[PDB]
Recover the amino acids of this structure.
């Protein structure tokens, strides 16, 4: 009986040594098996597979615990959807653009490139170790796992159209925003003291206007106390002037012929428009903006 | 050496038999130890303690795993805060009022009674087993643990003033609302098709008005497609007429002397105003309403 040693894993942190019978498929021995995202369930071992790490589905208590502790989800379909995405995202290109990891355009991924760029400019602490680890790898230039995890957590497949605001919201809901707070106080003559507090993810998002100065003025009448590391403001795409120095970064969305495309604008010493692998610098920017992000440097 | 057998646990699901030396405190043998919420760290075992279950802090891998799988949090202070709350909430009274578990007023708990009543009228699937288990016990009449867990998860202590909308929002963020959706479509002449989708917890909450008829008929102008088992609408407390049959339940908030009080109104065959252990039935209701809940029967 000819054999090789491989490692199995659900988290790529805890590796489990296995002896594989080379006359049987990976599926016959482990169940559904993946090598760097590729489904090798129906493949018989190759000699080249010696010592390599394979993902398997958590089919026992030990692996179930390891997966829950790493991904913070009990969804049994998660690993398969993550591997399916990773088989694609590992083939994308991740150029450094203006100091930031971006994504060369492929598979309708402009929304993911724009989200990835934004995530590198705001301070976020992810709760699942899987996102924290892959996020730091992405900041360092290797973003394939992060992008595939974003897709899996958001229940989106490679090639499916996506929305930056939605993606950021769902990621914020997997982050520690416990200290973030927005207090609304009613301005009235006879109603007394009326106050409500948004804590956590609700405090870092607002829909209806792009302008933080407009939001800060209130919208019946409210005084706003905003306390968070950042805020995401969103509105329907409309022509909007981004003035250098008045924001951190922003999402542009064009919808010509109902085929939409995102670009990312960031405010450094001047305005930079990052469009996947492309970079364009300008002093002023007017375009159909739909998200603006603001940062409190503290 | 005289001893007794007790069970230790972090989840009250997995019980671990221990032999206790009656000459040492529970703290010397287990660390921080609790009996039905009571801190017995400094108490020596009693003969009456034989065969009883004590909570301990998760101080080894086995207990850490059991606690994370049951509570879905890594906060080391959680168990201690849960036990402190439970030592109080176990002493509260939980009368059945019109088929619903309420709470007799104590320790400024009107917001918790109002939340508990609301939670029994909307269908919610909690992610942490600790909340799902305690919710079904609460529905059956034994709500002390559910109330203590709510306090622990919301980082509130017994006696601290609280907000129903906030409490419901934080609980919604621990529930499976993945299928919930609110689609907003812009009403315009020249802007084309503009649509954004709120998925999950954002879809089940709205702030600014109490009326669902107003919210749906415009919200510049938007067409709303609402798809969720329930929706919570909130606004500053204001005099508001609750019409029988047009809502499921509602939160009234009076602000007397800046120490406020909640009541719960539910629409059954007539209007029921549940004020802890107190009940008043009426055909009409006008009061300072701040939350209204609507349900999608299917
Ligand atoms: C009341 O406040 C807001 C806020 C944002 C709004 C956005 C829009 C949009 O039209 C966004 C623009 C970005 C791209 N998405 C698409 C990406 C592809 C696919 O995922 C469908 C959605 C559409 C409309 C109204 C908004 C209202
Ligand atoms: C823009 O949309 C909304 C929505 C809700 C609002 C509520 C209020 C209130 O005044 C709520 C009323 C309920 C009780 N809380 C208190 C409970 C005790 C303690 O937790 C402090 C808060 C205050 C004000 C404005 C609102 C605006």
């Amino acid at each position: 009986v000819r054999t090789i040693k491989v490692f199995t894993t659900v988290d790529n942190i805890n590796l489990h040594t296995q002896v594989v019978d080379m006359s049987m498929t990976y599926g016959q021995q482990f169940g559904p098996t993946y090598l760097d995202g590729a489904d090798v369930t129906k493949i018989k071992p190759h000699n080249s597979h010696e010592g390599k790490t394979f993902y398997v589905l958590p089919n026992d208590d030990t692996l179930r615990v390891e997966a829950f502790e790493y991904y913070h989800t009990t969804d049994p379909s998660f690993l398969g959807r993550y591997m399916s995405a990773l088989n694609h995202t590992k083939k994308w290109k991740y150029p450094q653009v203006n100091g930031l990891t971006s994504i060369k355009w492929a598979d309708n991924n402009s929304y993911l490139a724009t989200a990835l760029l934004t995530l590198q400019q705001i301070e976020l602490k992810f709760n699942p170790p899987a996102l924290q680890d892959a996020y730091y790898r992405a900041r360092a230039g290797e973003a394939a796992n992060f992008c595939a995890l974003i897709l899996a957590y958001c229940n989106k497949t490679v090639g499916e159209l996506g929305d930056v605001r939605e993606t950021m919201s769902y990621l914020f809901q997997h982050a520690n925003l416990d200290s973030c707070k927005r207090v609304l106080n009613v301005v009235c003559k006879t109603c007394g003291q009326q106050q409500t507090t948004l804590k956590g993810v609700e405090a870092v998002m607002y829909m209806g206007t792009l302008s933080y100065e407009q939001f800060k003025k209130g919208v019946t009448k409210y005084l706003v106390q905003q306390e968070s590391p950042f805020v995401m403001m969103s509105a329907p795409p409309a022509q909007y002037e981004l003035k250098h120095g008045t924001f951190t970064c922003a999402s542009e969305y064009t919808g010509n012929y109902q085929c939409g495309h995102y670009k990312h604008i960031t405010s450094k010493e001047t305005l930079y428009c990052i469009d996947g692998a492309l970079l364009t610098k300008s002093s002023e920017y007017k375009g159909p903006i739909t998200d603006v992000f603001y940062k409190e440097n503290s």
About this structure: The first strand of chain A starts at residue 3 and ends at 9. The radius of gyration of chain A is 23 Å.
